[PDB]
Symmetry: D2
Subunit: 330 residues, 4 copies
């Protein structure tokens, strides 16, 4: 055989990857996550899982064919979760997605059922992984993942408001004529309609925009900055109306969380976690606060000082979500 | 104004971009090209153009929402080609795409008709650009873009066999247990059914595989390496048969070429250029031969030493391409 | 020729060229970081000692397989620098153990008297990025000698200082410096001003959780962190004889914003006449928006009366030196 | 405390680094390896070791102050090898370096003594580490590291001729006006005066240059390509006499090797390994041949096809190296 004429083998390795990532779901969101993860050199193996055989294999092959341009030496796929074995990070994007007009809350039973199958299969093959939940409603499904996995809460993370805050800083950048890296602001709580823009923290170079304009984010705001937050909330509906779905921004957002997890950076991201203990929250509610994300998932939470009005929203969002998730059957 | 309280403007802005790239066509190929180029930090400005307004705007927005995770401070879109002004590189992906069972060669009339509209509009606003033709049949469409543009031939490049060769190298590495980066081999000629695998150049670490197994790639081969070329030829069709279209790998192939152009690398790539005066071809045929690629496009061509069979196969590719080029009007 | 039978040639200026003046330790650190962030299609190096220059060039060139900057050149002659987008000046006398950066001022004015016209001659449209010390005063000098508009004469300023401050903050809090925000402004030196009002994590003002933050009264002595920033160059010089890596990385970051027109904000040396009670041609670090045309805008940070005194002080000290200079 | 007010700790846990690298030696080579490794994002922890405490602490400090601009969250140092605990890769650059007119083979007795202390101490705390030897004479010292450590050969690698071939390819590129990446060719054997340029494998785009001119590399070469190899043999000495030492190129060479190991890429590199069994070599000689480098070090060796002259030169190199091995006093 040619190969053995060309190559003398020295040892038969256990081929166990050290930086394996799995993306479950090869719809648009999942493939966007896949490509962004590949072009950020985060993993040594990328596994794809979904339930339509032909599409799954088509996507696997299409990624495969770009390998010369990448630094991820093994890309694999299967309906069978054995393909996901030994992943450090499993990112779940499967499920029904919101159609035009449709609230993310309408996705909940469909996606809880899909997770009843998905989550046990992930755990069986990567008992030590971190879970990053992207499917919607992300806050409730992060909770569902947690319960079915049995994982300690540090290892079950939701993409949450990471994107909402990225979008926020982009709009702001565009208003100010400044790169969004240098524009800071946080959108926290539910990923969706009831999110809370924390106006008090919104700053460029440590200079608080609220201190310069005390009306910032109020109906009295000469410049209507509140519409920046409306734009954030409406963003995914707007994009779904225009192109049918969202992919690139969320892929990029998930990749950025993957980077923090895989490289143990300990950056701060506003992502979905279990916040019992805070802002008046007595139950097992997951929603977005600034979290320090690392190799062990969410290790620490930053306590943001909310105004009474700001804190009032949060407990609302909070109450809503508990009402829905309280009564789920799985 | 909250901006002026925050920011003292010190300089009047005549913003002209220095490294602007345009992608024409926002189908799955174009957006794969876009995302890949954004994640390789090649452009200070990215313009998108296509004819379905809503689709266009939603793609634009979706990418803009990822701006925080990117280094391309300006992303814009319009059906109007003035949005493409001052581009250093324009990448043309618009046009009809082959169905399952349909040759890329069957796309020629539809895509020539669209090229009569696209190329003059590109050239109008970006007199300095290189044109990177992706739309199919890419080799004939490179020729066509050249004829319409009035650009010199060095500035009109077809994506050509850059993908075919990545696939070949990928499949080769899989067989040998070597990264594609370290497996060498060239697929030349038409980007399509009549492509030519140059077995004589196929090597790992400078070791010719054909000299190891002389019947490499013939029907006599005990290991049927020709099936590797058959897989290269078929791959678009297999992927299309499975997922509907191809996107990620062609996108990576095009970002690779764009890297070489924008960063003046002078790397060698198998891409579409005029081969008149080689291999006994005296007509204006464009097909892939290995080309040195830089800031002024294709500046040099490597004359591959071809075995009589290989050269005959290359001439037959040229013959097939000329059979369709022969009859064109525009 | 072998070549002409291998290659048929069809066709006979760089577009993203950076020059680095000075191939001492900081200059070479600047060189390597720029080469690893793929910011340039040509890198040129200039200094006055010819073997040293040549050998740094060759050493970089030998790693070309691993880089994506296809042309690396060097020369004593400034014609090598032609068509630069950005010229980074690191040449001059360098800080010595237990000595202020202000002790280098006069000697470095004298070399810039030679360097700067030569840079301007071969790239009259470049951005100048000054790194040599004392950078604030030398950015002023570069600006007067060059005749460039002020947006194009940038001083590396307090970019490193704030990065140091952000590392140390991050060590204290157990958070990546990327998620620890805070600004050190004014003189790149002993009179720098930590702005405690802006120091935060996830938008949460550290000063609101401890109003005494950064003062004599702070139970947690956060003032020490700025003292550590002030003293770090002296420490590093004591231990290893100079500093190089951290400055290289600061300068690469600035170069990144410039070459890629990012319009990020940086605390870098710019002309401050007409802010903060300053009516002279002084340069010091304030948060500047940095892009392809250099410094286009400045953020007006809101300063507490000390912060402004302490800064108009820093401003004073420095115009105190730049006053009696002649050129 | 302000920390505790700002940040609720959710999780105690022992931080075990997953991708740690140590560099032994903080002279110019060691630090060049370090800055390159940090700038390619290969490690989640970097540890430095050397014998002079101030110098080591100052180098550590200076890197640390650039943390804002890096993605390697933990940088540490110590005279004490416990700081290197749980490394995946330990790079050894400590020892004497050659003077103008001095062979790297003159460094052997001094560097063997240093290695007697360093090696048991570096392998003590790192069960999973690979040893990448950089100090000279690298081939002999890779052998010595192998004998002292008791590691299996796949885990003990010499930087070898990775840089010689890089230099070869740069010079080649400058002759032909092609980027090094697309110029191919191997310098094998000793990293030093008895290296062997493999002209039979030297190619652009699969095109063998010897095929085009069989005088290539001989005294009858009208173009004197032998001089390119000569330039490779003398490079270090040339640079040593212009600037006092070499640093950047070797740093990049080693970071490239580190990349293949850390990212399990399985690329081929000419690096030091045991060649007992090949080219009629019957003893435990170490020298550079092309090896597949991955997460377990060298898993495979490519059997280069040598001409009788090439092979004689390799065997001659092997004799010289074996001859100094007979001098080794353990
Ligand atoms: O764009 C956004 O805001 C998000 O997009 C997606 C989120 C999850 C999936 Br699965 C698909 C798209 C969102 O819907 O939260
Ligand atoms: O995957 C491949 O081989 C190629 O992909 C595309 C090339 C151009 C466009 Br427009 C769309 C797809 C091909 O179909 O030639
Ligand atoms: O480390 C720092 O803070 C600074 O570093 C340098 C700045 C310029 C040159 Br030239 C050399 C070192 C400083 O010493 O001011
Ligand atoms: O430039 C080169 O070829 C090599 O550089 C170094 C190799 C190891 C150390 Br420790 C220091 C320099 C060489 O001298 O072998």
């Amino acid at each position: 055989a040619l190969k053995d004429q060309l190559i003398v083998n020295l040892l038969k390795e256990e081929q166990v990857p050290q930086n394996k990532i799995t993306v479950v779901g090869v719809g648009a969101v999942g493939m966007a996550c896949a490509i962004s993860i590949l072009m950020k050199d985060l993993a040594d193996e990328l596994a794809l899982v979904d339930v339509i055989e032909d599409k799954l294999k088509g996507e696997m092959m299409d990624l495969q064919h770009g390998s010369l341009f990448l630094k991820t030496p093994k890309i694999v796929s299967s309906k069978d979760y054995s393909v996901t074995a030994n992943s450090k990070l499993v990112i779940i994007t499967a499920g029904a997605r919101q159609q035009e007009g449709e609230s993310r809350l309408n996705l909940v039973q469909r996606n809880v059922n899909i997770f009843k199958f998905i989550i046990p299969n992930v755990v069986k093959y990567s008992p030590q992984c971190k879970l990053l939940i992207v499917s919607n409603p992300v806050d409730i499904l992060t909770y569902v993942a947690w319960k079915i996995s049995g994982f300690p809460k540090n290892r079950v993370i939701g993409s949450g408001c990471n994107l909402d805050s990225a979008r926020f800083r982009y709009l702001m950048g565009e208003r100010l004529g400044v790169h969004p890296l240098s524009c800071h602001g946080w959108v926290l709580g539910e990923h969706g309609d009831s999110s809370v823009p924390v106006w008090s923290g919104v700053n460029v170079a440590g200079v608080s925009l609220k201190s310069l304009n005390p009306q910032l984010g109020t109906d009295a705001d000469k410049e209507q900055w509140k519409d920046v937050h409306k734009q954030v909330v409406d963003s995914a509906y707007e994009v779904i109306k225009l192109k049918g779905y969202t992919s690139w921004a969320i892929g990029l957002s998930v990749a950025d969380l993957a980077e923090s997890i895989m490289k143990n950076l300990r950056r701060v991201h506003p992502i979905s976690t279990m916040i019992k203990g805070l802002y008046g929250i007595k139950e097992d509610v997951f929603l977005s606060v600034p979290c320090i994300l690392g190799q062990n998932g969410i290790s620490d939470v930053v306590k943001v000082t909310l105004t009474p009005d700001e804190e009032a929203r949060l407990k609302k969002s909070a109450d809503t979500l508990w009402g829905i998730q309280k009564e789920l059957q799985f």
